[PDB]
Design goal:
The structure is cut from a larger assembly and holds seven protein chains of seven kinds.
Chain A lengths: L1 H7 L7 H17 L17 H7 L7 E5 L10 H8 L4 E4 L2 H6 L8 E4 L7 H16 L3 H4 L9
Parallel strand pairs in A: 1-2
Antiparallel strand pairs in A: 1-3
Chain B lengths: L12 H25 L7 E2 L1 H6 L6 E2 L18 E3 L5 H11 L6 H4 L8 E3 L13 E3 L2 H9 L22
Parallel strand pairs in B: 3-4, 4-5
Antiparallel strand pairs in B: 1-2
Chain E lengths: L4 H13 L5 H4 L13 H12 L3
Helix pairs in contact in E: 1-3
Classes of the chains: A mainly alpha (153), B mainly alpha (168), C alpha+beta (248), D mainly alpha (50), E mainly alpha (54), F alpha/beta (260), G alpha+beta (133).
The structure holds one RNA strand of 87 nucleotides.
Subunit structure (chain F): Interacts with CDC4, PRE4, PRE6, RPT1 and SCL1 as part of the fully assembled 26S proteasome. Interacts with pre-ribosomal particles constituent NOP7.
Organism (chain F): Saccharomyces cerevisiae (strain ATCC 204508 / S288c) (Baker's yeast)
Subcellular location (chain F): Nucleus, Nucleolus
RNA sequence: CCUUCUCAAACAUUCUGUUUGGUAGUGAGUGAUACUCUUUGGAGUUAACUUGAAAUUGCUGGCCUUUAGGCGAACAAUGUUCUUAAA
C-alpha cells in the first residue's frame, strides 16, 4: 500500500488552483498573442469519480483500481471486486477513503482508477500489478468465500 | 560590546520578541519622521563593498533629498588613525559624532598622509612617529563628556588614567 | 528496532557511488601529483561560482593561499560516510554538522576539497562576515582557575587572549580577526585556537509553518549544490556573505 | 470484451474543448482588463510592498 | 457570419504549410490538433478564401 | 604498403564464395551474416591494459551508410539515427533545425534523447534494450559520452552499432549548430567506427558485399589498413566473412620480435 | 517437511550477503548466508541461500517476504524441504588480468608465423577457392 | 526506495576548423567464424540472438599489503561512525 501511494502521488490530479493558474498563464499568453504553439501530450491522472471508475471498466480501461474498505453505504461498492474479477481488472482493496481523497484533492473518494501511465512508470506499473495479484488474489481468494464474523463480543 | 554571550536558559524570548516587534515598528516609523524631517531619503542606501569592509553605520550612504557648538564639529578637520588594537565600533561612532575621519588598518587589510593621531592601547609602540600623536582612547571619552579639549599626557601610553566618573 | 529492508539497500548503493567517485578522485589526483598525465580528462583544475537558473561561472584554480571558510552540510540522503572522508572531516573537525571553520587554501590543500565536496559548502568570505562570526560566535577550550577542564569560554577577555598568545604577541580578538583575514604572520595559531565553531540550524522545523521553510530550503539546496562525481569536479563556491546572513 | 459497442467520441483524442472555451473567457476578461496578468500582479506587489 | 481571428490565422498557417491539398493537412499533427473533419477543413478554407486571399 | 592487387584477389574470391548457393518466407539472419565483410587485425597488445569503450573513427574514402540506408529501406530493420544531447542542448536545438541541414546532403536524424530520458523513461532493461535495438547510428555529446555506461547498459556496449559514438557540438566556450552540423557529416560519411577490445585480436566490421563496389571496398580497406599500420604495431591482417574462414593478406613478422 | 535452509530469488543490485545477514538477523539468528555470484566479475546472479538456527523462524521469515516488493522488482522467498543442504557457493571477486611472458623466443615464433601463414594458404587451397598469396 | 563522470587541452581564425585525452557492464541462456599465447591449467580477444531486472547451488585464480584493501592508481589502499527525514 505504501508503494501504491508512492505510485499514485506521482499521478496526482491537478488542483483547481493549479488549473486556474495554468489557465491564466495561457490566457495571458493569448492576450498578448504570443500564440506560443499548439502542443500538449495529454494530462495523465488518477480517476476517482465512482460512476467514472465503473465507466472506465466495461471497456476495459482500468489498469489498477483501489477500493476503499469503509463506505457507509457499502452497497455502492460491493459489486466492484466481483466486477473487476470477471472483467479481469487488477483491483485491490485499499484501507480508508480519506487516504484516497488526499491523493485526489477531495475529502473522500472511495474509488481510485488509473489508466494512463507514462513510459517512465509503465514498468513499475506491471510489477505492481504482479505484486498485487500475488499478495491479494492468491492470499485471500478462498477465505473471501467464507462467512466472516459471527463470533460474539 | 560585540562579544559572544552565553545564552540564558532562564529567560523566555516569547515576551522580548513581542517587545522587539513593537519597538521595531515604532522606531521604524519614528525613523521615517526623523529621516523625512531631516530632509533625506528614508531608505538608506549602502555600498555592498563598503558593508563588506565593515558592517556599521558607515556602510550606509546618506543622501541629500549649522552644527550646534561645541560638541558637534568638535575635532573639526581632524584626522584619526585608530589601530587594529582598539575596539573599532564605539570609537568609530564617536569620531563620526565629531565629524572627523576614521582610518583603521583592520579595514586596510581587507583591500596615511594626513593622519596626525593614533588611538591605541598598547605598551610598546613600534614605529613611534613623533609627528603622530599617541593617545589612549579615554581622551575621546573625556573630551566629549567635557565638550572640550584636554591635554593628552595622561592619554599617552603608558601613562595611568584618571578614574573616569561620567556626568551622572 | 526492526530497521527496514530498503534503507539497508539505499545506503549500500550510495556508499558504492561515493567509494567509486573517491577512488576516481584518488587515482586522478595521484596521476596529477606524480605528474604522469598521459590518458586522463584534464590537467588543470577548476572552480565553480554560483551567483544570481542562476549564473554559474568557472575559473581555473590559482595556486595561491586563499582564506576559505568551510561550512559542514548534512550529507546526502542515506550515505554511510567513508573512512577516508571520515578521516579528513575528523582532522578538520566537521562532524556534528552545521559547523564551519576557516582554512588556508594551497595546492596541497586543494585535493581534499575534491574529496569532501559532497559534505560541505565553500566560498569566498568577507571581512564583515568573518568579523560577525568571531564577535558573535566562538568558544575556546581553556585551562582555567580550577577545573576538570573540558572547559570552553566565550570570547570576552582579550587578556586571556594575550596570555596564551603573547609569544606571537597576539592580543585583542579583533586582531585575531585581522590575522585570519591577513594570514601574514600566523594563521594556524588562530586556527588551532578558535578550534570549535557552532552555527544554529536555520529553520526550527517541527510545526506547521516551518515545514514549508524546510521544503523550500531543500529545493533551494537541490538547485545550488551539484554532485559531479567526475573527479574533474569544478570546486563549487557560494556567497558565504549570503549564507551567513541565514546561519548567523 | 466490453459489454457495450459504444463508439468512441472525438473529444477523447484531441485537446479538451471546454478548457479552451474557459481560456477564451479569461482572454475576453483580460482584454477588458477585469483580470490582471500575474506577471503584472507580481509587479504590483513588488512596488506595493515598499 | 465571419471568422474569428485566431482560427483564420490557423487556417492561414495551414494554407501555407500544405497549400491546398487536404489529405496531407488531415494527417497533420501540428496545427491540426483538434483533428478537424475532412471537408470541414474545406468549408473553413473556402470561407476564409472568400473572405481573404481569393 | 599493402599489395592492393592481392586485396582485389581476395575480395573476388569472397564474391565467388558468397555467390555459391520448406524454406523461409522471411530470410535467415545467418543468410544476412554470410554476405558481410569483417576486417580482423592481429596486433601486439591491443589492450590499453584497460577497457576502451571509446570508438576510433577512421577516415574512410567511401561512405557505406548511404548504401546501408538504401538497402535498409528494402530491409526489415530500418536505419535510424540517434543523438543523445544535453538538457539545455535539446532546449536550444529543434528538429527542423537539424532536418534542414541534413536534407542539404540528404540524410536524416531519427531521434534526439536527453540523458534524463535515458535515466527515467528507459530505466528498465526490457524497454531500454528494445529502444536501443531499433537503432543503428547512435551519437552522443563527448561530455555525455563518459557519463553514458551506467545509463546505456552493457548490452549496448556488446555490439558495434549499439555502442554510442563521440561527437561534439562545441568548438568554442558554447556550442554552435554549425559544429554539430558539419560534425554529423564528418562522423556520418567520412569516418567508420572502431571498437577497441583487449587481447591481440581486433575485429573491424566493414559491411555487406551488395552495398559497395569491390574495388571501392579495396580502396577503403587499404586506406583503413594504412591508418592502422601507422597507428599500431600489427601482427597480421585476416579479412573475411564471419561465416567464411580467414584470408591472410598482410603481416609483419618483426613486430613480434619488437614486442620483447 | 521443510528445513531451515532458504532460497531467495530476484535480488536487487548491490544487495549482498552482508545486508542479508544484517536484515535477516532481525528475524532471528541465522546459520549461514550465501549469494550466487558470477565468476569473471563478482556480481550477483540475483538469487541466494539462507540458513537459520530454526526451521520455524525460517518459515516465519519466508512468510513476510514471499511477495515482497523491494527497490524496483519484487522478491520471492521459498524455504527448502527437509532433504536439502547448502553446496558450492563462493564470494567471487573481480578477477583482474594477468600477463605472463611468451615462453618461446622471437625466432621460434617467427618460424611459427611463417608456418601458420603457409598453412592458412593451404587451407585456402583446401576449402578452397584460389588465392595466389 | 538512492540516483548514475552530463569536458579537457593544444593548434588555428574558417562567423569553428584541426589533433589528442577523458567511459568497468544486468543477470541468465544460445551461437557462427576465428585469432593469440600459455604449456596444457587453459587464458585473453571475435559475428549474431533471446529475456516482464527473469533467476536454485558453475565447488577454493595468482601476486602484494594490513588485521579487510590494489593489481583501470605501490611506501597504493579500507570500516557502515552526518540527526530538527523526531517523536
Amino acid at each position: 500500500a505504501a508503494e501504491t501511494f508512492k505510485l499514485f502521488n506521482k499521478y496526482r490530479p491537478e488542483t483547481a488552483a493549479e488549473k486556474k493558474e495554468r489557465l491564466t498563464k495561457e490566457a495571458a499568453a493569448v492576450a498578448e498573442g504570443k500564440s506560443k504553439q499548439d502542443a500538449s501530450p495529454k494530462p495523465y491522472a488518477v480517476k476517482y469519480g465512482l460512476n467514472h471508475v465503473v465507466a472506465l471498466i466495461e471497456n476495459k480501461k482500468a489498469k489498477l483500481v483501489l477500493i476503499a474498505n469503509d463506505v457507509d453505504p457499502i452497497e455502492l461498492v460491493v459489486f466492484l471486486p466481483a466486477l473487476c474479477k470477471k472483467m479481469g481488472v487488477p483491483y485491490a482493496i485499499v484501507k480508508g477513503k480519506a487516504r484516497l481523497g488526499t491523493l485526489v484533492n477531495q475529502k473522500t473518494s472511495a474509488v481510485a482508477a488509473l489508466t494512463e501511465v507514462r513510459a517512465e512508470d509503465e514498468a513499475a506499473l506491471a510489477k505492481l500489478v504482479s505484486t498485487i495479484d500475488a499478495n491479494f488474489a492468491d492470499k485471500y481468494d478462498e477465505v473471501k468465500k467464507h462467512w466472516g464474523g459471527g463470533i460474539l463480543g | 560590546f560585540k562579544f559572544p554571550e552565553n545564552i540564558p536558559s532562564d529567560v523566555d524570548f516569547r515576551i522580548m520578541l513581542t517587545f522587539l516587534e513593537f519597538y521595531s515598528t515604532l522606531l521604524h516609523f519614528v525613523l521615517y519622521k526623523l529621516y523625512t524631517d531631516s530632509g533625506l531619503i528614508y531608505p538608506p542606501k549602502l555600498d555592498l563593498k563598503k558593508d563588506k569592509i565593515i558592517s556599521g553605520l558607515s556602510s550606509y550612504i546618506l543622501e541629500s533629498r549649522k552644527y550646534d557648538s561645541p560638541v558637534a564639529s568638535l575635532f573639526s578637520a581632524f584626522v584619526f588613525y585608530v589601530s587594529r588594537e582598539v575596539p573599532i565600533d564605539i570609537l568609530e561612532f564617536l569620531i563620526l559624532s565629531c565629524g572627523g575621519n576614521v582610518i583603521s588598518e583592520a579595514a586596510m587589510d581587507q583591500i596615511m598622509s594626513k593622519v596626525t593621531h593614533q588611538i591605541v592601547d598598547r605598551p610598546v609602540l613600534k614605529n613611534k612617529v613623533a609627528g603622530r600623536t599617541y593617545i589612549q582612547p579615554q581622551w575621546i571619552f573625556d573630551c566629549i563628556n567635557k565638550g572640550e579639549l584636554v591635554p593628552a599626557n595622561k592619554y599617552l601610553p603608558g601613562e595611568a588614567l584618571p578614574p573616569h566618573l561620567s556626568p551622572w | 528496532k526492526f530497521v527496514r529492508a530498503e534503507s539497508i539497500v539505499a545506503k549500500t548503493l550510495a556508499t558504492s557511488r561515493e567509494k567509486e567517485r573517491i577512488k576516481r578522485v584518488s587515482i586522478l589526483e595521484d596521476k596529477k601529483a606524480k605528474n604522469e598525465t598521459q590518458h586522463i580528462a584534464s590537467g588543470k583544475d577548476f572552480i565553480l561560482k554560483i551567483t544570481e537558473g542562476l549564473i554559474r561561472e568557472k575559473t581555473t584554480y590559482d595556486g595561491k593561499p586563499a582564506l576559505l571558510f568551510i561550512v559542514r552540510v548534512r550529507g546526502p540522503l542515506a550515505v554511510n560516510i567513508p573512512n577516508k572522508a571520515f578521516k579528513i572531516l575528523s582532522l578538520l573537525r566537521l562532524v556534528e554538522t552545521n559547523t564551519g571553520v576557516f582554512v588556508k587554501l594551497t595546492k596541497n590543500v586543494y585535493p581534499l576539497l575534491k574529496v569532501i565536496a559532497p559534505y560541505v559548502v565553500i566560498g569566498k568570505p568577507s571581512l564583515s562576515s568573518i568579523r560577525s562570526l568571531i564577535q558573535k560566535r566562538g568558544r575556546i577550550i581553556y585551562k582555567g582557575e580550577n577545573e576538570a577542564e573540558p572547559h570552553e569560554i566565550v570570547l570576552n577577555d582579550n587578556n586571556i587572549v594575550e596570555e596564551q598568545l603573547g609569544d606571537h604577541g597576539i592580543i585583542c580578538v579583533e586582531d585575531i580577526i585581522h590575522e585570519i583575514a591577513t594570514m601574514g604572520e600566523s594563521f594556524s595559531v588562530c586556527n588551532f585556537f578558535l578550534q570549535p565553531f557552532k552555527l544554529n540550524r536555520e529553520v526550527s522545523g517541527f510545526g506547521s509553518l516551518n515545514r514549508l521553510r524546510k521544503i523550500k530550503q531543500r529545493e533551494a539546496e537541490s538547485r545550488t549544490r551539484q554532485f559531479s562525481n567526475a573527479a574533474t569536479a569544478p570546486v563549487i563556491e557560494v556567497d558565504i556573505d549570503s549564507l551567513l546572513a541565514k546561519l548567523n | 470484451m466490453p459489454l457495450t459497442a459504444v463508439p468512441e467520441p472525438k473529444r477523447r483524442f484531441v485537446p479538451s474543448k471546454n478548457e479552451a472555451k474557459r481560456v477564451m473567457k479569461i482572454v475576453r476578461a483580460i482584454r477588458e482588463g477585469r483580470i490582471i496578468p500575474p506577471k503584472k500582479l507580481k509587479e504590483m506587489k513588488x512596488x506595493x510592498x515598499x | 457570419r465571419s471568422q474569428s481571428e485566431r482560427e483564420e490565422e490557423w487556417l492561414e498557417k495551414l494554407y501555407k504549410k500544405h497549400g491546398d491539398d487536404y489529405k496531407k493537412m488531415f494527417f497533420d499533427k501540428k496545427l491540426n490538433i483538434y483533428q478537424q473533419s475532412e471537408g470541414d477543413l474545406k468549408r473553413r478554407l473556402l470561407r476564409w478564401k472568400k473572405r481573404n486571399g481569393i | 604498403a599493402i599489395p592492393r592487387e592481392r586485396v582485389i584477389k581476395a575480395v573476388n574470391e569472397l564474391i565467388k564464395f558468397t555467390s555459391k548457393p520448406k524454406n523461409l518466407l522471411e530470410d535467415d539472419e545467418e543468410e544476412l551474416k554470410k554476405d558481410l565483410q569483417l576486417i580482423v587485425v592481429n596486433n601486439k597488445s591491443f589492450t590499453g591494459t584497460s577497457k576502451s569503450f571509446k570508438l576510433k573513427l577512421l577516415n574512410v574514402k567511401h561512405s557505406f551508410y548511404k548504401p546501408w540506408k538504401e538497402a535498409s529501406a528494402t530491409a526489415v530493420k530500418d536505419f535510424k539515427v540517434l543523438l543523445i544531447l544535453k538538457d539545455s542542448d535539446i532546449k536550444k536545438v529543434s528538429e527542423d533545425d537539424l532536418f534542414d541541414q541534413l536534407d542539404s546532403e540528404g540524410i536524416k536524424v531519427d531521434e534526439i534523447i536527453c540523458g534524463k530520458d535515458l535515466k527515467t523513461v528507459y530505466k528498465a532493461y526490457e524497454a531500454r534494450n528494445a529502444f536501443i535495438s531499433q537503432f543503428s547510428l547512435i551519437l552522443a555529446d563527448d561530455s555525455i559520452v563518459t557519463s553514458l555506461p551506467k545509463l546505456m547498459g552493457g548490452k549496448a556496449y556488446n555490439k558495434v552499432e549499439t555502442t554510442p559514438i563521440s561527437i561534439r557540438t562545441h568548438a568554442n566556450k558554447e556550442f554552435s549548430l554549425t559544429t554539430l552540423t558539419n560534425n554529423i557529416k564528418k562522423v556520418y560519411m567520412n569516418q567508420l567506427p572502431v571498437k577497441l577490445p583487449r587481447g591481440t585480436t581486433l575485429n573491424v566490421h566493414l559491411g555487406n558485399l551488395e552495398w559497395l563496389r569491390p574495388e571501392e571496398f579495396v580502396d577503403n580497406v587499404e586506406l583503413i589498413s594504412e591508418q592502422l599500420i601507422k597507428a599500431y604495431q600489427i601482427r597480421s591482417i585476416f579479412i573475411k566473412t564471419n561465416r567464411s574462414p580467414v584470408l591472410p593478406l598482410y603481416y609483419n613478422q618483426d613486430v613480434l620480435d619488437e614486442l620483447e | 517437511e521443510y528445513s531451515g535452509i532458504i532460497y531467495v530469488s530476484r535480488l536487487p543490485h548491490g544487495f549482498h550477503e552482508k545486508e542479508l545477514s544484517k536484515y535477516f538477523a532481525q528475524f532471528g539468528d541465522l546459520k549461514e548466508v550465501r549469494l550466487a555470484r558470477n565468476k569473471k566479475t563478482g556480481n550477483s546472479r540475483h538469487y541466494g541461500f539462507l540458513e537459520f538456527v530454526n526451521k520455524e523462524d525460517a518459515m516465519i521469515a519466508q512468510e513476510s517476504m514471499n511477495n515482497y516488493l523491494l527497490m524496483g522488482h519484487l522478491l520471492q522467498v521459498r524455504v527448502l524441504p527437509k532433504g536439502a543442504k547448502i553446496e558450492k557457493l563462493y564470494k567471487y571477486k573481480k578477477r583482474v588480468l594477468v600477463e605472463k611472458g611468451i615462453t618461446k623466443p622471437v625466432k621460434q615464433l617467427k618460424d611459427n608465423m611463417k608456418q601458420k601463414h603457409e598453412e592458412r594458404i593451404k587451407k585456402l587451397a583446401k576449402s578452397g577457392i584460389e588465392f595466389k598469396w
